[PDB]
Amino acid sequence: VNPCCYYPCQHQGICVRFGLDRYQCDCTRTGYSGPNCTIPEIWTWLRTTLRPSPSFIHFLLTHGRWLWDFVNATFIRDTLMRLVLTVRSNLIPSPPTYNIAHDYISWESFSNVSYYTRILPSVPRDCPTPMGTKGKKQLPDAEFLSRRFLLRRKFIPDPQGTNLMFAFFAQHFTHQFFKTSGKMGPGFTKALGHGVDLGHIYGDNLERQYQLRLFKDGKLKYQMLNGEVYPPSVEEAPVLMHYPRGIPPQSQMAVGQEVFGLLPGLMLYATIWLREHNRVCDLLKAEHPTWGDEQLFQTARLILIGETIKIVIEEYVQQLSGYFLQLKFDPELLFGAQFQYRNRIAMEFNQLYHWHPLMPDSFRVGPQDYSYEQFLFNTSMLVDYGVEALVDAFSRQPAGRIGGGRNIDHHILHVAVDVIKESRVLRLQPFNEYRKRFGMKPYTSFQELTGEKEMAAELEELYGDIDALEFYPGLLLEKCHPNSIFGESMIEMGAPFSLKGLLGNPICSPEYWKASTFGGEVGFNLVKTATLKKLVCLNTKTCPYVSFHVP
Amino acid sequence: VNPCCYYPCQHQGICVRFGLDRYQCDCTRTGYSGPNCTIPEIWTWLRTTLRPSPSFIHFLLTHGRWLWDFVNATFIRDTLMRLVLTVRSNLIPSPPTYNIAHDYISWESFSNVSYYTRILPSVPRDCPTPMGTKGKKQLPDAEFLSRRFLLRRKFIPDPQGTNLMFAFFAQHFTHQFFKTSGKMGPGFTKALGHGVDLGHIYGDNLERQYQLRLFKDGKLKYQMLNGEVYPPSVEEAPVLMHYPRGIPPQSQMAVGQEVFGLLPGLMLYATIWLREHNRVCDLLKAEHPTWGDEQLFQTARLILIGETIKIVIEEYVQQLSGYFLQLKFDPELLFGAQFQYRNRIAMEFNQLYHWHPLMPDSFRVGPQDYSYEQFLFNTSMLVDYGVEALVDAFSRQPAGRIGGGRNIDHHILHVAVDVIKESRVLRLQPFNEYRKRFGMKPYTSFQELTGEKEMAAELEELYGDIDALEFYPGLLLEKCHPNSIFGESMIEMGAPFSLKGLLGNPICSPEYWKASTFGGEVGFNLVKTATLKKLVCLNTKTCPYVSFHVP
């Protein structure tokens, strides 16, 4: 049997097949040596035994407000943010390594941007079991697994107070770098760009971008409805949008991300961001009357990218982490560090981000309560209520807890079923292997994974061995931190991907992070002081309750 | 008038148009301050006043063999190589900045790989003169300029002893990353990859690659002639090649770079490298009997990329530079430094690499002397003589001196004429501006540029002002270093572009530079010990005189 099926190499060592039945582990720079990269070097040992557990650190970060309030007002804040940024980032290979086609470094994997990368190589196709060596010959039925442990019975709100304003932002934001190609199959993406390029606003290709642009003042095409600004119709912006057959072009809104017409929440943000882009163009023109359409457009896009990163780190991730430490977006924090300003979306990151539990049982907008059937392909709700109204409603309605299990609404449970199926097609390694790859000890049992006994027992019977537990199911069923939105794994694995994706952007490099890049001091400050509240309120007639936290 | 036409901002400061007639310079991180970034900071001043001139350093590097021999044997070698690598590299912006369409940072310039980047923004289209502010309203006729100062009269051999083996390597090597698109126009390239990706061997696109591959043992297709291995014919490898109409497919060789069938010298290297690829596949299969075609192919490609970089730095640049310092290819030399492992080909780099003066009056192969008309599209010479014979001939024939002027054979003078024309289309800034951008003082007169009076006087009459002298003409007409192949500019401007292109390759990154990346210790050593002699001789029946230096 293939010796690499036993995942012999530890601590990022690379398993290579040699001869007919042998294997060797390349422990280069792993900090370890030995046949399996398990014998540590002195420093590797100190470091690993002095490192407190993720749970302990989480505790420190979510307690002692008074002490943190002091720390947040000093340079210690920066010192810690830089620490967070570098330690989380180093866990992500850069340049990227493997893809669905190559379980080894190759020029094709490096240059071929249509591929999602992957942190761990796949489970060799010739292993005795689907997960490698452990588990049963056949994995649990995806549907059953989903109905049994992910289906929502009673809506469980997020203890951290996360609202739908956050949920939809999450969806909107991620769908700019998660666009799995149906034509090329899993493992492939149309979101070339691999990060925060705002392609869900400008399009993932030039032609579409040009069709969305006004080519006047660097602005984006738009239309007026009830005296408000909204994305233009597909009639005025002949772009491909995924709308149900039967919906005429003049009733479709053209935005950048083909799938956004499928949710008011999504089109809401599409509208907000579009309004903001045109707004920045105005400010820019005031500063540079000699500039043409291109430069105004390009420069505005850069400002919005900056705004997006700012809001995501300081407000989105802040809300999501619940830390008392004040997260900070300051590219300069890495100017003295070794860091590659590039990023490549990993398939695991795609899986991990399927936060469908966040969606509610229904959508409350004022006195009205809308059902999934009234909400999903609604082409009028956004215009009927307008931006302010929806922002207020979404900011007030709690979102469901992500981890813990049994919390995905039946209307969208099919997505989880497909994520599990894709996982197997992608031949993703077992959850415990990913635990190790991200610095955690593997779970020794299901009862340790879940903080209980009922589900644990059933999972053990189904999977047969904790070492067979799959990636996504593991993330969603892992016991949550005290009163947190999800378990440690989601953070320990999710943070590295996110932070590398945010800071890995070229505008965060010494070369780009200059006032001139954003049209001058005025443009630079729009980035440096971006805010969710300002994003909405500087573009709406009135200012509603806007936040990622429920009131 | 546009204030940026005066190139007011110094030391890489960025000129930005403000209001109707104003401008501001963004001096961020330039080491200077002031309206024009001319007021040096304390360290900036020390460094600039303690830095000896390029000529002085050149002198040190080309004298005192005894001392250098001692140094080359110590760690000082590594120390100096690190220095050269980082100081030269820091002069190249990474991520890249501008392109033919944008004279400012933009997401499109960053993501759009079909564009060549540029170090200096173009001469604003609305400047009083073509070069900005200096010179005449009309630039000198390209043809005349070429016939007057670049046309070869009497063949001037390279004093450093460079041969045609080197000359053909240079052409072969560069055409993998210099592939200007005719359909898209100047400023656009088909060599996505922007570096040493060996696309001239494997193709610049998958389809072409696939057509060139055997899909067995990871090898490339090939054919046998006179018992020797050669690239296959277009009949077996249906791939687009630029051969003159009238030549049958059976006489066309398929290699990777469409234009290589136009010179025995080029096809020679195409054959050598192809033989080497298949050779490495053999060694790999011996090591990994379980490997499939893909991995064998991919891994062999990585090894060849490494071999190419090793040889280019330790033998190619060594010969070219004339330095007594033993250059060294070692990715680890940068592991402690801040360095972006990415590269983007600059249009200026393309211009500067037009080394046509290297070509001779005719091509001597043994007793026979071949004219340009007998050499250029010869489809039989390579097979008639075979690899060993041509390598020996090309290694023995001296190549022409690059700098100095009046040394380009009339047969190819038209290329220079076009380079000058493209320069104007690309609106490249004046030579002196590039001098500054690369750390040199601008020439105060033509007589200072050339080391003489006659041509100087005529150039002054034609251009009117030293500040109007164009990029390429400046590189070729600048007085050469003592007994060197070219002037300081060629080195001070080209070295940064070159070294960055070599070390800024993903295989030189901590993540890729591992034995596992190249199939193990055996594959790694092929890179670490690559040599021009071995490249040829481990793939030929007999071993001829092989070198970049004439005997």
Ligand code: HEM
């Ligand atoms: C109205 C509620 C939602 C619905 C109806 C919905 C529906 C879907 C559907 C149909 C798919 C593709 C399924 C397939 O191809 O089998 C999908 C993918 C996805 N969804 Fe949702 N979703 C919702 C909310 C969310 C939220 C709140 C997030 C959190 C950021 C999210 C994140 C994702 C991700 C990351 C993907 C995969 C992206 C890709 O591979 O292209 N979804 N969703």
Ligand code: HEM
């Ligand atoms: C048999 C001798 C040679 C001939 C006939 C030749 C011919 C040409 C021609 C016809 C072009 C394109 C001209 C145009 O589009 O107007 C060209 C481009 C070029 N040549 Fe040569 N060349 C020769 C030797 C060399 C050598 C020794 C080098 C040194 C590395 C070199 C470097 C280049 C470069 C860098 C380009 C531009 C690449 C691009 O933009 O695609 N050439 N040459």
Ligand SMILES: CCCCCCCCO[C@@H]1O[C@H](CO)[C@@H](O)[C@H](O)[C@H]1O
């Ligand atoms: C003073 C420093 C002492 C360092 C000793 C560290 C002991 C690490 O011990 C290692 O543990 C691994 C996992 O159990 C084993 O696989 C290795 O073979 C073993 O050497």
Ligand SMILES: CCCCCCCCO[C@@H]1O[C@H](CO)[C@@H](O)[C@H](O)[C@H]1O
């Ligand atoms: C109170 C000081 C807080 C400093 C923030 C540390 C940054 C978080 O660091 C994280 O710690 C985890 C647990 O050890 C590791 O598993 C992660 O890989 C690491 O990135």
Ligand SMILES: CCCCCCCCO[C@@H]1O[C@H](CO)[C@@H](O)[C@H](O)[C@H]1O
């Ligand atoms: C005697 C030791 C020599 C070490 C080689 C130094 C590396 C070359 O360094 C170069 O020197 C030039 C001259 O000032 C500068 O103009 C270039 O910008 C710089 O990169």
Ligand SMILES: C[C@H](C(=O)O)c1ccc(-c2ccccc2)c(F)c1
């Ligand atoms: C700052 C903090 C950390 O590094 O611990 C952090 C950073 C990013 C995330 C995060 C995890 C998953 C998706 C999106 C964001 C997270 F949950 C926590």
Ligand SMILES: C[C@H](C(=O)O)c1ccc(-c2ccccc2)c(F)c1
């Ligand atoms: C090592 C040395 C240096 O940095 O001075 C060096 C490095 C690269 C070049 C070089 C210049 C133009 C084309 C190709 C190579 C060169 F001419 C000299």
